[PDB]
Each structure stands twice: as C-alpha cells, then as structure tokens.
Write a protein that binds this ligand. Sequence first.
Ligand SMILES: Nc1ccc(C(=O)O)cc1
Ligand SMILES: Nc1ccc(C(=O)O)cc1
Ligand SMILES: Nc1ccc(C(=O)O)cc1
Ligand SMILES: [Ca+2]
Ligand SMILES: [Ca+2]
Ligand SMILES: [Ca+2]
Ligand SMILES: [Ca+2]
Ligand SMILES: [Ca+2]
Ligand SMILES: [Cl-]
Ligand SMILES: [Cl-]
Lengths: 376, 376, 376, 376, 376
Amino acid sequence: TITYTSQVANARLGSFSRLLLCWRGSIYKLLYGEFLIFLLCYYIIRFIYRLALTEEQQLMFEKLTLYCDSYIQLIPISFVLGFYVTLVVTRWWNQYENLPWPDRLMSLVSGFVEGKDEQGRLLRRTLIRYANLGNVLILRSVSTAVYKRFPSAQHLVQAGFMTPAEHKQLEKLSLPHNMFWVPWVWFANLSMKAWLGGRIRDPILLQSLLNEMNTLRTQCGHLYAYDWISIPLVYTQVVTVAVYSFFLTCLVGRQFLNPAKAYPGHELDLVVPVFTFLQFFFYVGWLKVAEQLINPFGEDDDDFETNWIVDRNLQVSLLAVDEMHQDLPRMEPDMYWNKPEPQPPYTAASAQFRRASFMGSTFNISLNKEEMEFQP
Amino acid sequence: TITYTSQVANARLGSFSRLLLCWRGSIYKLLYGEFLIFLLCYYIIRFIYRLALTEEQQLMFEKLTLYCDSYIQLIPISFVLGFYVTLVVTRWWNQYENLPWPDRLMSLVSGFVEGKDEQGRLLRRTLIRYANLGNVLILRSVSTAVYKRFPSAQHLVQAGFMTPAEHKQLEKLSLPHNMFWVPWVWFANLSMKAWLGGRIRDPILLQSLLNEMNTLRTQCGHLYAYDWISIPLVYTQVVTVAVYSFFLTCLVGRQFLNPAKAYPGHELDLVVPVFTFLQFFFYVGWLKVAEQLINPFGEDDDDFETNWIVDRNLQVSLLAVDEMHQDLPRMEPDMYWNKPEPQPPYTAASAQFRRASFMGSTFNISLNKEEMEFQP
Amino acid sequence: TITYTSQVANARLGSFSRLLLCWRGSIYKLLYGEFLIFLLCYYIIRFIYRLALTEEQQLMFEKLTLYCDSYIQLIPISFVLGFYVTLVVTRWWNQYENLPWPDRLMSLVSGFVEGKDEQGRLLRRTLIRYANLGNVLILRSVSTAVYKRFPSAQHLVQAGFMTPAEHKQLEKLSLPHNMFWVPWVWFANLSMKAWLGGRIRDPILLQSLLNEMNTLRTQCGHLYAYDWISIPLVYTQVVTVAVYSFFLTCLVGRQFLNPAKAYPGHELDLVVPVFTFLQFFFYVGWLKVAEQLINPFGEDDDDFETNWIVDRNLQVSLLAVDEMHQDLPRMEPDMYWNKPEPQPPYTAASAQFRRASFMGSTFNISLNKEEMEFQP
Amino acid sequence: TITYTSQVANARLGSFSRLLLCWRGSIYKLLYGEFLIFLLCYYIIRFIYRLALTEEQQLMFEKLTLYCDSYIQLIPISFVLGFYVTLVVTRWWNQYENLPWPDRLMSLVSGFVEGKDEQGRLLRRTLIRYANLGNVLILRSVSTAVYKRFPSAQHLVQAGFMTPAEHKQLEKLSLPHNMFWVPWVWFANLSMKAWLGGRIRDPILLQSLLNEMNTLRTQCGHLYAYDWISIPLVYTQVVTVAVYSFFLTCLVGRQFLNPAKAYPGHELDLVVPVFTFLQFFFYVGWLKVAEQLINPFGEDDDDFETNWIVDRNLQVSLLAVDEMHQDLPRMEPDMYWNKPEPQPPYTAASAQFRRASFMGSTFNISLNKEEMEFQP
Amino acid sequence: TITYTSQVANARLGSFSRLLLCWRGSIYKLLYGEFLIFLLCYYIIRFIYRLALTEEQQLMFEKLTLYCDSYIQLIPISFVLGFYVTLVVTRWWNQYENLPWPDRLMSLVSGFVEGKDEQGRLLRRTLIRYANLGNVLILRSVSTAVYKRFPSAQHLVQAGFMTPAEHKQLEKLSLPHNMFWVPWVWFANLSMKAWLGGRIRDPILLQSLLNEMNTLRTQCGHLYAYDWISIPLVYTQVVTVAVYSFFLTCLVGRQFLNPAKAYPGHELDLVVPVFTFLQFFFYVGWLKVAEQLINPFGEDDDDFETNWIVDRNLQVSLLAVDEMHQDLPRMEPDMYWNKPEPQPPYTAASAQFRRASFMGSTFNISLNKEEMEFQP
Ligand SMILES: Nc1ccc(C(=O)O)cc1
Ligand SMILES: Nc1ccc(C(=O)O)cc1
Ligand SMILES: Nc1ccc(C(=O)O)cc1
Ligand SMILES: [Ca+2]
Ligand SMILES: [Ca+2]
Ligand SMILES: [Ca+2]
Ligand SMILES: [Ca+2]
Ligand SMILES: [Ca+2]
Ligand SMILES: [Cl-]
Ligand SMILES: [Cl-]
C-alpha cells in the first residue's frame, strides 16, 4: 500500500503534480517495460518504411497508414476502460472492507468472559486465538504474501497461530474443501461451553459474542468469494483486446509519412510521436490500474499489507483479552467536573480552526411581524 | 467459474495479455460461431460483388458501400453496450451475494442445540438438513445444472436431501406455487419444539437461530426474484439490435472496392478486413459478457458452480452440527502465554513483507515549540 | 413481467438474437405507433420537397438540410438518455426490493404463537391477516391492477382481506391520509395481547415478531414514497425534449437531397433512411425503456404482477400459520446418518458439472526448501 | 412535490410527450427568466451588427462569429452536467430516505407502554410527542417552509409541539449548538422511568423502543449533515461556469451573418435560432434539475412537502398511541376459515391480471429418461 | 466546510450564477496560482514566437502549432476526469458518513446507567469520555487540524480528553501500532463492572450500550482505513498527467499565429485566448475538486470541521449524561389532549404550504359499475 494522504491533505499549488516524482507504486514502474517494447516496435517500423521499402512499397505503406488513421477511435476504448476500471476499483474497496478486524469481538471477549485466574485467561485467549486463526486461514488462502509466510499448517503451528492439538483436530476433520470455517464452529462450541460453565454470566452476552464472530465469518466468506469468483475472463479479454488493438493500429497509423508528399496531418515530421506516447501513457496506465487492483492480495506496491494486519490483529487481540481484562485506569472526576460548558483549549497552530456552530440553513431567514403571525 | 486470480496477483509485464491464450470461458469460445457466420457472409458478398455483378451493378454496390461506411458511426453501440453491461454485471454480483451459505446457522446449531445422544444428533442434523433442503429447492428452481441433477423431488429423496416423510408432507401441503419456503416453516416449528423440549436452553438462543434462518430465507427469496424479474426484454432487444445492425452494415460498408476506381480510402485491397474483425471481437465480446452473465446459473464456463456449492454445504453443515458438536481441541496455553508482544516469524520468502505500522497521516507533521502551546 | 431467464441460461449461438422474435413486452410493441407517425411525417416532407417546392425553394430547402446536418450530434442525447435510464432502472429494482413478502413473519408466527385450539388458530390467522391487509392496502394505493381488483374497501371485505369489524374500525379511525399504517398498529396491539395471554411464551419472541412486522412496514413506506416522490418532472421533460428535438431535426436534416447537385453526403438517394430509422429504434427505444419502467406497478407487459403476489402471499401465509403449525414430518435418521463424507449422486445429464473444490488462489504457489524455513 | 406517477403508469403512445403540457414544476417555469434574458441579449447583439456596425466593424464581427462558433464545441457541457446532476439526484433521494417517520416507533409505543388510565395515556402521548418534537426541530433547522411555519420555539409552543415546561427546559439546557438532539435524551430517560415504574413490562421491550428512537435520531443527524455539508462549491461553480460560458459564446457564435457573404453555415438567414434555443432548453433545464434538487427542503414545486409530513406524523402518531392502544377490531374467523386454498375474487376490470404462478426458470426443461438416471 | 444551502434553497433566477461571486472555497482561490503560471508561460511563448524568432523559425513554430492544435483532441480528459472525480466524491461522502457522533450512545448512557449520586455521575461521565477519547484519538491520527490542536497525548491530558491515570495506562499498554482501539476495551470493561455493580439493571441494557459503542468503533476503523488506503497512486498520476499534458500542449497549439499567413483557423487574432482560459478553468477546476476532496480532513475551506465536531461532541455528550440524566420536563397533558384530529396552525408566511394528503397514484382511477363487479 502506497500512502500519500498526508501529501494531499490540502489543495496546494500543484498538489497532484508533486506526486509525479514518485517511483514506488507509480505509473512509470508499471508500464516502462510495455512502453520500451512499443517504442522498439514503432522505431523498427519507421526504419523499415524509411530505408527498406522501395518507392511503390513506400506508396503502399503510406496508403495503409492513411487507412489505419480512420479506425483509431478514443470513445469506445475510453468507455470500455472507464466501466471496467470502475468495476475493478469497486471490487478492490469491497475486498478491503471484508478484511476481518477482531476489535469488536476482542472488546466483547475482554468484557464478558469473566475470571482473572488461569482458566479465565486461557478461555479468553483461546476464543480470540480462534478468531485470529480463522482470519489467517482465509488470508493464506487468498493472499500470496501470507501464503509465502505460512506455506503449510505446520508453519501456522510453528508461528503459534495454531496449537499442535488444533492441528491434529483439523487433520481429523479434513474434507475436500478449504477448512477456514472450522475455527468459527470451534468458537461457537467453546463459547457455549463457557456459558454453561458460568464464565459467561448471561445468554444475552453469549448472543453478542456469537453475532460478532458471525460478522467476521461473513467477512471471511466474502474474501473467499472474491478470490474464487474472478471478474469474468471475457470482460478482461475484451478490455485487453481493445487497448492492444488500439496501440497495434497506432504502430502503423501514427507513423510520420514523408513530408515531401504533403498528406493531410503529415505536413510536419517529428521523430517522436508525442501525442501517441501520451495516449499510450494514459490508456495503458488506465489498464494498469485494473491490472494492479484486480487481485489486491498479491505483492504489488499498492496491494494490501496483509502480513502487517495479521501481526497487528494477533498482538492487539491478545493484549485486549489478556492484560486489559478488568484492568481499567483509576476513575476520577475529569477537568470539566463542575463546568456546564467545557471548552478545550486551542494551540497557536490550530487557533484559526475555532468556528462558530452551524445552526441550520434557515437560521438567517428574516421575516416581518405580520409574516410570523399564526392564522386561524 | 473460471478463476484466474492467481495469474493476475501482480501487475507483471503483459499480465492481461497472457490471459488471451485461454480457451475455457474466453471470448473466442463465446463468439467463434458468430465470427464464422460473419466471415462466411462477408466473403460471400465480396465474391458476389467481384464475380457476379455487371458494371452498373458494381457502381451501385460501390455507392452503397461508401454510403454504409460513411454513416456507420450513427449506431450508438458503445453507449448502449456500456450502460447495459454495467447493469448486467451489477446484477450478476448481486445474484452471487444471495447464494445461501449455512455457515453462521451451522455454527449456531452446533453450539446451541444440546445433547450428544441420538436425539440431539437427529435434532441438529434435521435442522441443518432443513436449511440445506430450502437452499437446494430454490437452486433447482433457478439453476439449470441443479435441475439436471435433481429433475424431480424423488431425485431429492434418492440423493438424501429429503426424507420420504418430508416428501409426503410436501405433497400434502402442495399449492399452485413454488414450495421452496416450506423448509423454513419446518425449521421454525422444529426449533420451537426443541426449545420447549429443553434442547435449546434459552429463548435468546432460539431468536439467534431463527434470525440466521430468516437471513437464508431472504437470500433464497432474492434468488427467486432475480430468476423471475428478468432485465427488461426491451433493453436487451435494443442492445442486440444495435450490435447486429452495426455488423450487418459492416458486411457491405467494409467491402474492399475495386482499387481501379480509386475511391478515397479504397485504394488498397487487403482482402482480410483486420480492423473490422478486431471491432467484431471487441463489440460482440462486450455483448457476450452480458449474454453469459445475464443468467449466471446456466452451464456457461463463467457461470456459478451451484452443484459444487450444494455438495459442499451439505458435507460441511452435517460435519459441523454432528461430529464437531462439543468436540473441541485440547485447550492449552499458546506459545505467547507470557509474551507481552508476540512476533510470529517470517520465512525467507516473506521477509520483505515485514512492514512498520501505519500510525496515521498526521504522524510526521512537524511543529515549532511556540506552535504547540495552548492559548487562553 | 416477461420472463426469459430460461432462454438466456447459456451464451449459445445468437442467444440474444432469438429474443428479437418476441412481441409481448417487446420494443416493437412499445414504439410502432411513434415510428409510424415519424415515418408519415418524414415521407410527407420528402414529397413536399420533391413536388411542391420550386427550384429556388428547393435550393433553400437543400441549404436548410445541410445546416441541420451539423446539429444532429448523438453525443448529448446518449449522455442524457444513459444517466436518466440508469436512474429509472435503479428505482425500478429498488421498487421491486420493497415488495413485502410475509415469509419471515409467517415462519415466526407459525413457530412462536402457541395453541392448536380454536383461539390459537384464530390468533395466528388474525396476525398474518393483518400483515396481508397492510400489504394489500399499500398495493391498491400504488398499483393500478390491484386497484382495479379492489376499487373500494368494501371490495376488500368481499374478497376476505378485511372483516366487516375491521372495516368498521378503519372507518372509525379515518384521518385525511392514506390509512395503510393501521394494520401494523393492530398487529403490535394483538401481539402484546397474545404475550400477556400466555400464547407467546417469551418477550424475546414478541420482539422478533415485531421486528419482522416493522421490516414489512418499512417496505410498505418505501413503496408509498416511490409512488409519491416521482422522478423530478424537469428531468423527464429535459430527456423527452432532447429525444424529440433530435428526431424533429432528423425530419429535415436526414432528407435525401437531389444527387444531381452532388452535395457531400447526399450522393446516394436511398428512399428509406436506414441509419435514421436505426437511430430512431435505438434512442426512442431507450426512452421507452424508461417510459415503461418509470411506474412498474401499471399494466405494461414488463410491469410487476402485483395481483399474483397478493394471492400467493395470502395462500402461503394462511397455510403456514394455520395448517403447518406444529405439523412437522417424522424426524428420522437421514441417508448419511453414519457417512462421514456424504456424496450425493449426479445424473447422466449433470455428471459434467462435478468439480473439485477451489482451495484458494495461493494453493499452487511452489516454494523451495530454502524459501520455506522461518528466519529468526 | 409534483406527482405524475398515475399519468406514466403505462407506456402509452407519447406517454412522456403529454408531460410537456405541465406548468407546475416544469422546465418552462424554471428557465423562462433566463431564456428571456438570453433572447433579449441575442436580438440586441443582432441589431447592433445589422444597424450600428460599419462595414469593417461588420467584417470584424463576422470573423468573431466564425471563431466563437468553431470553439463552442470545446466546452464539455454534457459530461460535467451528467456527473454533477447524477450526484445531486443521488443526494436528493438520500435526503428523502432520511425524513423521519414515527410509524415503527408509534406501533411499539402503542403496544409496549401499558395502561388505559390517564397516566398511561400521558406517558404514551409524551413519548411520541418527544419523537415528533425532535423531528420538527431538525426540520425547522433544515427546511425553509417549516421555518416559515415555526420561526421561533415560542411558535412551537403555540402550535402544541412543545409544552411550556419543555420550552423552559430547552432554554435551561441551551448550548451554542443546534439543540435538535435534546428530545432523544428526554425520550430515553422517560422510557427508563416508564420501565422502572412498571409501565414497560420487560427490558427487551425497552431495548426495542430505544432502537427505534435511535434509528430516528440517525435519520435526523443525516438530515443535519446534508444541510451542513453542501456539495463542494468548487464543483457547482465549475458546472455553472461551463453552462453560462457555453450560452454566452452562443450569443455571438450563433448569430445569422449577412447571407450575401455566403460564409458556410450562414448563407441562409433565419431570424430565430431554433437549434440554439433547443440546446438552451436542454442544457439549462439539465442544470435547473440540479438547481431545484440541490436543496430539496426549499419552496420549489418539486421540493419535499415537509409541512404536510409534520402534520401527518403528529396526527397519526397521537392517534396510534392514544386512541388505538389495546383497541382492536373483534377477532373472528375469516372468510377462508376452513378453505385450504383461498382464492380472492377478481373484478371484471382486473380479470385479465389473473396469472399462473412462476415456478422457476428450470420448470420447462425437458430431459430424456436416460438423462435422469443417477450414476454411481 | 463552506455552506451555501440557504443560498440555493429555491431554483430562483440564476441561483447558481450568484455563487460565482464567492471567494472562500471557490475555483478562483483553488487555481489562481496555476492560472498565473499558465498565463506567464503562454505570453512568454507568444513573445518568443512574434519577436526574437527568425522567418524559418516562425514557419517551424507555425507548423508545430498547427500539429498541436490538430492532435490535442486525442487526449482523453473528460472520461478519466469524470470517473476519477466520481470515485473521489463517493469516498469523500463515505468518509463523512464515518465521522463518529455519540448521540445514540449518549442517550443510552443517560438512560441506562443509574444513580444521581457522585458515583453514578462519575461512571456516566467516564463512559461517555471513553467514547469521546476514542473519537479524538482516531481524528488526531487522520486529521491535520486536530493533530495541530493535539500534537501529543500530553496535549490531550491538558485539554481534559484524558486523565493522567488514563495517560499512564496508555503508556503502559504501548504497542508499535496506533492505540485508538484502547478506549473501546476500556468502555467494555467499565460497562461490565457497572452491570456487575448494579448500576446497569439488566444485561439487555448492557448489550445495547456495547452495540452502540461497537458501531462507533466500526466508524473509527473506517476512518483509519480511508486515511491509510489512499486512492491508488497510479490512477491519480494518470489523471494528473492527462490534465497537465493537455494544458502543456495548449501552451503551443493555442497560440495566435501571424494573421498575414491566413492559416485555416487563425484568421482572427485575439491577444487573450478566451476559449483556452475557459477550458483551463473548467478542467483544472474539475481536477481541483479531486485535489481538495481526496483528503477531506486537511485544512482546505471545503474540508470537514473536525475541531468543531470534537468540541461539540464533548459538550453535548457530557451534558446529556451528567445534567440531563433523569432530569425530565413536567409531564402534563398537551394542547391536543382531547382533540381527535390535531391541526397545528400555519403562519401567514407558510399558509401556501398547506397541502392535501397524497392518497396514492390509483386514487383518481374511474371505473364503470360493470367494471367493479366481482366475477365468479
Ligand atoms: N501522422 C502522425 C503521427 C504521429 C502523431 C503523434 O501522435 O504525435 C501525430 C500524427
Ligand atoms: N442525407 C442522408 C439522409 C438520410 C440518411 C440515413 O439515415 O440513412 C443518410 C444520409
Ligand atoms: N488558434 C486558436 C488559438 C487560441 C484559441 C482560444 O482562445 O482558445 C482558439 C484558437
Ligand atoms: Ca495485485
Ligand atoms: Ca449464463
Ligand atoms: Ca409501467
Ligand atoms: Ca430547492
Ligand atoms: Ca483536503
Ligand atoms: Cl478493415
Ligand atoms: Cl440555430
């Protein structure tokens, strides 16, 4: 993930222009190879036309180049690229929204599951570990970085996501499908056992724990669905064919003919087709947005940092359910204990952001005495 | 479903270009028949014009070709295709999102319904089987593959989805409507009976079971609605006529006229209209995206694997509620039992994915000592 | 509703082309009258230009046609039509999604409201009848077909939706507004009475019943809102003016001028303006899609079958709460009672749809032994 | 709100054309002033060229007219108008969806809060009045019509929305912000007092009341947010400048020059620029859609009827919680008491709408006897 | 945030035109710097071309200008800008929808947590302060204005958001991640302690408190996600390059050449390019919409007022849970105590907004006596 939120906080002078000096997760990094191949092909065709072809062959090539210009339309390529990239970006954000975070669940497990003894600690840690294990199982199923980190369930055991007993149970339960759903059934059964054992005081609390767990299950299922149900290959092939056909036509149609024969639009002979290269940049970059975002769990620069999320979730969830259980700061009266209207101070840097309240769009309407009188 | 998520994990050199060498669920497989018909017609009209028309007839045909070529831009094919295909793809993903998964319900039935005896096993299996029966009834109503697998309720009985008693009860209840809603009423009544019999310990647990079941009912109803309420036929007819009229005009307008007559743009006879064929691939493939996705429960390569989903749901749900009920792995301290900050290891392959935490876009803002002083 | 889901299950050879031979809910049925008027006007103008106008008047008419030709640009009409039709189609599907189905509520009333005696039957039937009465009240408010079926509350009484006592109570409560909200208050009061009378065993069950009823109330309110708050008339007038101005300009601008004068673009005098008629088909059909979908509760072929929904809901809901209450099929061990991995059979027709499970996109990543050891 | 749903129920002959004969909430009413100003400016420019300008001045004006007409196309009025109006219409419907309706809350207050004595009546009326008071406070904050009806809190007291005691309490609580949130805290505290006093029998019922009230609070907060967070002024200024620049250029570029000079496009003199006026109608009406819909709580014809909603909500809510509490119609066996398959009658007008049930898209699939055998 | 809702309440004569005389959050303020740089470059190129350039160099420059002006339209600028700005605006409103408001939570804490003594006051204030502390932690993580106000946790302690005990506890719990999640775990533990201590009377009330808090946690997580996961840098770079390439081409292609040469399109020389400047305003303003809205938590004029929200939330939440707990206005019969149909009065200014109720689109449908008869 390339984060530039801080750089674009304000709409300053050339805010977006300063982002063109970035290499990591940039357009240049994405399309330099394709641009070099296109450049080599274009200049090979140019040299063949200018040196190898005879006069009659040169005239035939010039007619072919003039005929190619009529089939280069930007409206269809722009429309198909716009729709396809919009779908890819929508799916990309939906995929991010389905990354499971244990924060709601870990707050409920910290609160509800009682006991500061070893058994209560073990129960809370086991429940939150089941949540983390389900998340890491689906992530190593869908993310290449996580898979490279945990290429086998034995790696999960060595890393401490799974105990050897849990590994044995998963091997025993093995079916010919992905087994990422198992820790959620384990969580439900352990929560029920905790409630029957008196560690969860009320069934309303048990229902709340299960609702959080089921929300995480739904998120994991969505991740699996996005990994499995790709954007239809016909749509991807259509957009690829559109872009590549456009630039294969541009290889011949955008060749600078002899300025001696003053063909319309060929009176000036540049050596570098600036507009063709700009169009290459725009359209191939638009396609590379989709290329990078179509699977956001790969190892691209702008792909999700799944390994960081896995580590953070484990650390934070274990701290929440183990050391922060019934460990609250001393409850004392605050700064505004007898202040009816608290007014926190502003720093010198932030004094200009002190604003009067917005009281509604109708606040400043002025009416006469006659206009405000109720009628019978 | 053709899955190519693994192939497009990273935006490598020509990432989308390598997908053009795929046959299953590809553009070529979708439109090779239409392309062969178009090619045959194009070369029939070419041979009629060149070998079976007189001079005056040839001149008339050349005028008709110039008129077709000059006015083919009047067909708004890209606009109608874009807006239609976007709607089709939206409905396709919505249809997938309404495929019922019993995973939340199966976890709740595994937890809540108590009893390791025969009566408990039968009760849990019966509830999860009612969920699976409802799902398979709606799927065989809307999916051609599932219908071919279960062309009658007796096939459901032979396949073990439906008990002979359940078949008799469905025949007894028969109304002049689709009976996919019956297993949900059966589930509600059996859950109430289980709660009254003490197998479900608290009514809060019964409410949770029914809320999950009702979610599945809503998903099944959405599937039925999508099957019934098609995309309006007028919209489909409009888009079809746009594409077919474009490529029927192309039959005449894209003919290579006699180079002797020296018509503007017809000086070169290439025999093969390469750009017309590229346009055919692009526009007919764009239509074939909608053609394949308009009913995602058919037998296309990119259609949903409904039979696999049916089999997996049955296997997983029965395992979850029968063998995994109160069958938990041994609960022992994990490897980070007294580690305040766990740090799972990284492999050699994944060492480069270890990242520092994102602490917010404001983390690196630098302020002077005077700028950070509170003002009165 | 014209349903063609079965016809478009697979992307076969000319799948969408076979739908062009449909008359009911087709484009031809929608625009034949407008097409005939446009054709009659076009050919009257053509005959006036060819016969009535003198030489100087013919030259003026030809200048007018050339001047009109520059202003028949399709880029604006496609933009307004696409955005407007997208809004109409979105509202159309949202309107369908707000059709109330009592299936969740009917399952909860069948389960929760106890009693196989006359009083329990009467209570369950009365609750589900209140739900159906609310639905039919809003539908006859918004749907012309339902109104024609029930043009008065006495028709609802004769049809058995409403008892004479309920009719008297509605007359007694009458306010100067639509009274579709009344049965929901009746349902809440009757549910509370049932819970106080011991027919509903727990307040958790009562809360579940009320949540389902309130969901149906929200759906009915959305239906009322869509019926009341039309798409702004200015937007509809704008899109209508765009299309009609385009095809009124086409009456003069798309006249075939005398080919003798060799005007640019008028060299060939086809009698029938094939491209103008295709443009008419596309743009007026796109507008007719909106015209038919703008109120989906009328009597168009593609409008919703509200009367069928009313009848089905009543039949199903009454059967669910009356005959199917505590009427469960015999609960016996299933076909896979001691089968750890059930495998339902495939028919000969469906054997090709058996697939191996998708195990995740990272399953087939290969790593070396050196890549797979954890680093400290 | 202009409702034309009844007029557009069916796709009749020129359904949308008959809406061009509407004045209230029409395009004509919205842009007649701007059209008159544009007409006055255009003909005044024409007169100055035809009468005040000398020969060399006329030639300079003709060059300017040829120049402006060529680059009027450079303004992409259609794309920016389409996107901006789509955003405005989206926000308009979202704003409507956040108009609070107390129907779910009023059903729960009617059911749950017990007591047919004076204290129960007073408690129910007070709770529903707090809901209505919150709604009217936010509406008079955001709606000009409601503000004109209630220009002060004393007007709310005179109109009976607020008791003098409630007014005194609001004055006592006054903070430098909008106080629309106060009645929700009052509702929560009064509900808690009712539950502690035995008027609400169970805390599950109290939770249901508070969930409904909080939904209304969220809707009111969304209304406040839409009133406060306008569409960014830069976007509105961009679209305004695009449209106005287009039609200021058209003042000069669409002038009918001297026919004698025969400049291409100006060789024929028509005093009325029909196509420029049609373009004015289209583009300025497209902008006027956004102009009217940008604040849907003003006093436009197509703006929301907030005063009607306020009156209806108060009447209906008070009737539901006061007169309709435990006042149910006599519960008697219905018309279909012993009818297994009820079939409500159809009128003569509605007999054609009787349809057979849709049984699924797979219903009519035909298979051979061999195709329906299960294989081992 | 610039609010102009009051200015655009009605679609008056040139309502959007009057907004062009705004400076704060305007197009002028956003792009005056870029416009001055573009002006300086354009007039430097003009002076280089007209003077200090030889005849042959002038001819070369004229050929370059004709080439650039002819091929400038090849840049796709409308399509990419439309799609990108739509994505930015969608994300901007989603970011606003995730700003946490404690109004639901504050009502529940005011109602449920009992006790008018010091301990109850302290418990309520502490819970609502935990909610506010979580909100301000995430906001200072994502908002530059809030960070400038609270550049350290010690500033939060001095401002009264955090007690020194809470600061010590946060320092003790420190992990290498953002610690905005801590107050939610504190809230859950303190709520559980309150329920065990009898301050919360029922576990259903505790579940309602935790559901509200978890909703606020989800909103904070969404804010963090939007701050972290920027719009892909490749997409931003593509759009920036499109706009800047367009106007760098316009620097040369939109030069007014020597009128002596009488180029087709340069016959009129105006020193100021009005159309190029209009295009600059339109396209660069469209980009500045995205530039300002890409991070809505900066210090732009149209950015969110996060400091105001922080102050208001603290003032309102503390007042709601401390001074307004069980402090209700006197419950007395209202103005309509025995009025079956209340009718609040209208003022003279608002008398025209009194409307009859909309009774449904089918209300005015007329039928014959024969059409209304039920058929057998
Ligand atoms: N004939 C041409 C060849 C190339 C270019 C260009 O894109 O720069 C323009 C015209
Ligand atoms: N001058 C013309 C008139 C009509 C048509 C057409 O639409 O076919 C084409 C050219
Ligand atoms: N040749 C031209 C130079 C500049 C302009 C313009 O004002 O945009 C138009 C034409
Ligand atoms: Ca990727
Ligand atoms: Ca299909
Ligand atoms: Ca209709
Ligand atoms: Ca308005
Ligand atoms: Ca900003
Ligand atoms: Cl070709
Ligand atoms: Cl005109």
